[PDB]
Symmetry: D2
Subunit: 499 residues, 4 copies
């Protein structure tokens, strides 16, 4: 006998054993007499149109697929709960944090960044870590990564970056020349690249990695006072990674190493959990902060800004039907309950538009009416009507315009957002030449040891070696801007691999 993943159908049969099998019907609910044989004229004659059983099944098979996620396609899923363990009501007035002990249902999806639906799991890439909270004040979507930082700091570059990471427009192959030519021309990627090419680029499953909000957010309390914050949900199972040697073996042996691994864990009772922290910065402290506090390529050092604990995330349930429950998941950074708000972070600004837009394409205009996406612990009432695939009462015979004298839904004045003062020329400001190396230098010298740095340069050199010599020499000097020995250690490796 085998692992719980392999016995899915086995267990389905026994969990039903007492009952008789159900009647096999068409999509209109009409029972079928034969579904192994086609309706023809004579044993060796042509098929008939009158066979509406054949058409109904085949027509639905033809439309099984939907457009896959533009990024983060390869994914695993689970469900669970969030429990508050410490009081942070002085910072936020959000209902999700109201009192210690309070539980709220969650949903989580894991993913890579570049690989398609059929791609391998154990490859060097950032990891997706999206969490949906089902609160009474509507859903809260915290769409984070396994890294506190990202490769760029302007939303106009995101389409570009992605194109550089995927397949050549002509040959449809992954192209090292595309990969590093973007990175070498944009040194602000030197922070996140350094993260990606040492040990934590390939995590040993999804349960042995941390998760970060990365972006700075705003918190607002009852008194109407505001602060900025970071989110860090760290693993209780502890950080554990794969070696380059055997992570490559799993790519062919078991492409879904993580997918299987997550499912197996929950089914055998070992429910994975994470501990949620925040960091806090006042508007005054934002004014004296050395770098831009909304530069996504920057962290807040722990010395200057310690972690404040909030609660635990626990996943304790596997999905029943993957497509209906994990593939149709939609997370929107714009989904924020009263008390939590976005900062002027340029990269976060761009995510407010981009996500709701693509969902309307990928899933459909009424994608928020799908069960897993629905805000089922809140009362949705508005003046929105109609759209393709409307599934509920459509809010009945209620008036559909505002304002009105007929007692349709009303505003809630308390739920107004925070007021900030801004001024300056409305202009495209140059952020390409913000500090690209300081926090990177710190990472290299202070955080890594002598062999981790040695392994770090091997992993880069093993990937950069395929680019053109002008790209190589351009990238090396970018690495030299962090540390002379760092650039030179990479360069020593490249010189022999170029024969």
């Amino acid at each position: 006998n085998r692992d719980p993943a392999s016995d899915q159908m086995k267990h389905w049969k026994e969990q039903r054993a007492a009952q008789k099998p159900d009647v096999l019907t068409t999509g209109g609910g009409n029972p079928v007499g034969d579904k192994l044989n086609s309706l023809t004229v004579g044993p060796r004659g042509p098929l008939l149109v009158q066979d509406v059983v054949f058409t109904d099944e085949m027509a639905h098979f033809d439309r099984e697929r939907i457009p896959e996620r533009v990024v983060h396609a390869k994914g695993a899923g689970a469900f669970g709960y969030f429990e508050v363990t410490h009081d942070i009501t002085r910072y936020s007035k959000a209902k999700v944090f109201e009192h210690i002990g309070k539980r709220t249902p969650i949903a989580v999806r894991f993913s890579t960044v570049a690989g398609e639906s059929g791609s391998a799991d154990t490859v060097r890439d950032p990891r997706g870590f999206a969490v949906k909270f089902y609160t009474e004040d509507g859903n809260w979507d915290l769409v984070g990564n396994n890294t506190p930082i990202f490769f760029i700091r302007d939303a106009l570059l995101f389409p570009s970056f992605i194109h550089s990471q995927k397949r050549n427009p002509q040959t449809h192959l992954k192209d090292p020349d595309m990969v590093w030519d973007f990175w070498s021309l944009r040194p602000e990627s030197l922070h996140q690249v350094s993260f990606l090419f040492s040990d934590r680029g390939i995590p040993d499953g999804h349960r042995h990695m941390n998760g970060y909000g990365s972006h700075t957010f705003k918190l607002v309390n009852a008194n109407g006072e505001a602060v900025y914050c970071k989110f860090h949900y760290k693993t209780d199972q502890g950080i554990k990674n794969l070696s380059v040697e055997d992570a490559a073996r799993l790519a062919h042996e078991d492409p879904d190493y993580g997918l299987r691994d997550l499912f197996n864990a929950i089914a055998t009772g070992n429910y994975p959990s994470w501990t949620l922290y925040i960091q806090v910065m006042t508007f005054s402290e934002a004014e004296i902060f050395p770098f831009n506090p909304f530069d996504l390529t920057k962290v807040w050092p722990h010395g200057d800004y310690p972690l404040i604990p909030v609660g635990k995330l626990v996943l304790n349930r596997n999905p029943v039907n993957y497509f209906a429950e994990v593939e149709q998941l939609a997370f929107d950074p714009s989904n924020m309950p009263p008390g939590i708000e976005p900062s002027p972070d340029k990269m976060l600004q761009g995510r407010l538009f981009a996500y709701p837009d693509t969902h309307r394409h990928r899933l459909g205009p009424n994608y928020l009416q799908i069960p897993v996406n629905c805000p089922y612990r809140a009362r949705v009432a508005n003046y929105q009507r109609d759209g393709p695939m409307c599934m509920m009462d459509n809010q009945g015979g209620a008036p559909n315009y505002y304002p009105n004298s007929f007692s349709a839904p009303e505003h809630q004045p308390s739920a107004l957002e925070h007021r900030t003062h801004f001024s300056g020329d409305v202009q495209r400001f140059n952020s390409a030449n913000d500090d690209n190396v300081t926090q990177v230098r710190t990472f290299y010298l202070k955080v890594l040891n002598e062999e981790q740095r040695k392994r770090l340069c091997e992993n880069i050199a093993g990937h950069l070696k395929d680019a053109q010599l002008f790209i190589q020499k351009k990238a090396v000097k970018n690495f030299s801007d962090v540390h002379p020995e760092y650039g030179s250690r990479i360069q020593a490796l490249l010189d022999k691999y170029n024969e």
Copy 2:
């Protein structure tokens, strides 16, 4: 105090008087603070992206519309029940007819044919009459008209025929020459054209007309014995028409005369009723029938085949939301429960493919999971999976392939189809030159009185005058082929209209 239609919002406020208004939220359930004023920089400044209240409200408004029905676009809807009053179980084994007294829920839609969503109700056109029966053996959809016959008798001419009835491909106008250029080249339409331009072309609302299944269908009883049948469903309110004089006046004064009429009736307790009847033809009678028993341009005379009563359809409930309940209604002739089966009628065979096809475009692949389209009085179980906008559990983790050794749904042998024998060359057989005049001649001479024949020709000449003269005299020729006196009473008038 005004008519019940107009006092919809007045009544909605009364039903809610005790309650206080709901919290206005986004689609993702977050309450909005202010939804009358925009988020800007300064009192006379620009708009921000950080306003997600605006973006998601506007984006949903953008996508309100779905493609209208390709035909029968303008529509009215109601709900009620089907009640069995007589026993016809010797003919059929369908659960909808299992015993006297039994009630079944129904859904009805009334419509014109050509006009678009904004067209007038009171125009000369056929009238759609669709009934959906929610049986325990799945949904049964009886999709009929207010005429026992149609304009053509082969499926390949349908798209063509429709185009001719709609708008010119360059000018986007109604074009008389198109209409009659088609009708004169296909003389089989004489029968349905003669019906259309009589008094019953323009009925006084939807409650004052009969319904007809038109097609020949098959009935099967428990023993496996089969008969052919027509469905005749007559009004209890009695036939009542509008003159062309007041029909033209109502066209501008009230574009939705029928729509209001139906709603007002149901709201005031004035429930509309029609009786269902059948005509039966044995397989033996079919072979000796002087005409083609499956010709959609032919009727079965009452003398040789009297009417057998079955039951009552009553409408007693108005829709709560028009879009969700009436505009998303789907009817499929292919939805046929055991006991009811198709005949070889050329036209009906085409409609098995067409309707499931078009609905997957208009509404979506998973359109059958829409409440009003859902078979809620049956259990759907099969091996169909995924597709955009999947709305239930997706049948859980149940095995998705057949056959299987894991007790997934099984076929029911009881539900096999009636087996018939056939012979002939597989080829395209010409139906142009079946008898096109005889049944028309009796209608003119035997059924109509002297005054009705006069108006019939006035109405044609009043419409045919707008075509070219070479088209006119070819159409006139067809009218003489029915009867010499018929043809030239029309011809005498056209020559008047030609100055």
Copy 3:
């Protein structure tokens, strides 16, 4: 012998007499043997799946329809050129205004607001007047109306306003309680309501009405200096209106009166033309303006701001296919060539988002590659790829990421936008009670004569008649704020309409 429109088919045959008719083919180009008869087993036997001729045609008929426009569904189109008559290079650097004599191809669409694809033309409602310019600096879309003003001055009320102008969500009938409940609660609409119920509410065709850009826009010259402006294109054919008597007869007699007229004009050589003017306001003149200069409910008086002529608009070409060239037209206010830019107008800012979004839904993601929508007078080169229905080379094997060291397209610094300084709070400012009556007080007393004031109230009283007494008393009070005698007239008519 009849109008040129009705003789569309007649001409087509004459234009092709010398040629032989084409071979009738499937969509895939395969020649059809017979397309009047279905492939069946024996003369009275069932249809075959093997009939691939049938399916191909039948399936495309099923998907003929696309979602109609959410607003301004009923439309008419034409084509022509714009020609410059005076030099205003001192105000704008846009190449469309480079020198006197320069022509640019245009595309125009006329439309109503509320009516659907099948509605009447001769009805009281605003009239759309969108113009597309095909410049070398990309497409410019000026999407204006036949009025200088609108009903509301914040885009958050637009979805709500439209709902009130359309059909009730339950009854699917037009309801005057919805109309006047909205209008009476929002007295800022007093100005545009006065315009609509005046003589110019029902224009005599599309050739006898003015057109306005309505919004304040920003012009920029070669030195970098900027000014604000309004766009007026006044009729050369003259203003002419229809009586309430004449408009109502036409509603049923000719629903497409506007579509027929415009087509007949161009076809017969009688080409309609407009003269394009602008108003100019400096940044200085903007600060001292008594009202808000970007308020869409406000006009700029001609005495203080005279009209400066630019050029002529001529329509000289009918569309070849309505659907391909007029119904698939898409206009984006966001389409602005260097030299023309948006003001901070609250209503205009919303339209920058709304239009490109809705077109991706209505038509598709690649709606800009449809021939009539394409910028064919510019060379399109960027880092955008793929999408459903990709129609060109897809920009070949060019690098798809930016920046790059492989000489893909570069940004043009000349096309940088004008930099403005703003300051103030970031919140939602209340704009509901800016001066709503003064300019309306001017319209009533100064522009109209005593006879036109009499008819104005009559048109108002005849439609306000249908509302509830409490909505009536609210509306009259709002009108009384404009002028006491104006308010007292309307109610004086209502006391006679209430028996």
Copy 4:
């Protein structure tokens, strides 16, 4: 200096050196001023909506993906020509076979079956070999595999087979119980399974395998005489296979081994080619044939029916843009030019519906107007109009109905199909118990040698060992029904693999 594929961008810039790079523009053709920095209020302020450069780009990045193919999603592409070398005009009157030396433009797509977009190329599975011929009488799609047979022989079992080959609906993992439970319950798969698990399961790229039409097809010559046939493509590069050991290594070392191998071949001039053969069987010989001649699980032995040469397929051009030219390719078996027609093959009859159906969803209703899908060597003229994304003149102001008196396209009587007559009860005939063993026993004993049979069982036993014991015993028994030793060899390995 590297391989040609990786130097694609390098070559692209060299091909342009003389030219200056283009100006980077929006989709509307408007030049952009900067596309590296956003439009904000101050250096650390919020984003504005009036920035339409961001939205236009971001909204198109959001819609880049379309649904992948329901099967055969992973792909590679190339183009070339078909050249006739022998005369087969006595069998077919098709223009593609008119005379020796005749060229036709072709398009070819290679693929696996089960794997999604991102999966590895070198895996055990059937391989797709679709060819699209661009003829004068429309496009011919000969959609074939690398195997003469298939796993099933009824069109109602196809969805079920596919579901069993792909991912479990709960765990989203590949499931051996799903795979073999099916195969064991349908013993007809014994023939194709035996092929799959042999050497020719894993081909050494796409250049070293044969391709087969599998289905029996109909050929009709100029006289109207008819015969049945098979299509065979044999490689001119020779059959060549990978060991499972090397195919596993490449799975992680090179996920796109096949795709690049093809591209590198063409680019270096080394063009791949295949030789087209046919088998022929007269109406006389078909009735005396030992098995069913339209059984997709059966071959025609070469002893009785030898190969007849036709021509050569040559690939000498790579795609320029993969997505526009390979991802949007659509092959329809229903696309057949006069002279080629379907047999009554139950499976082929079903493929006549499925492929046009799925494309309407995947790509869109007008998917044939896409360049690569378009029949650009024939003239498409018909009475099909409108539909989403209409891209040409839409056939102008031509009459849109048939028949008509206005010289619109006419049927071509010469292109009527061959007429056969069939008889027998119209009923659902059981196909489960046709001979499942004879031809398999042949393949095992005659074609394989000692060493290949030895590996065949090893390759089977290596996969079947992961299924349950009740399934193993059921599968082995089906292998025993082929040959005692064949069953016995498998069970000998299973006993060791079961510890």
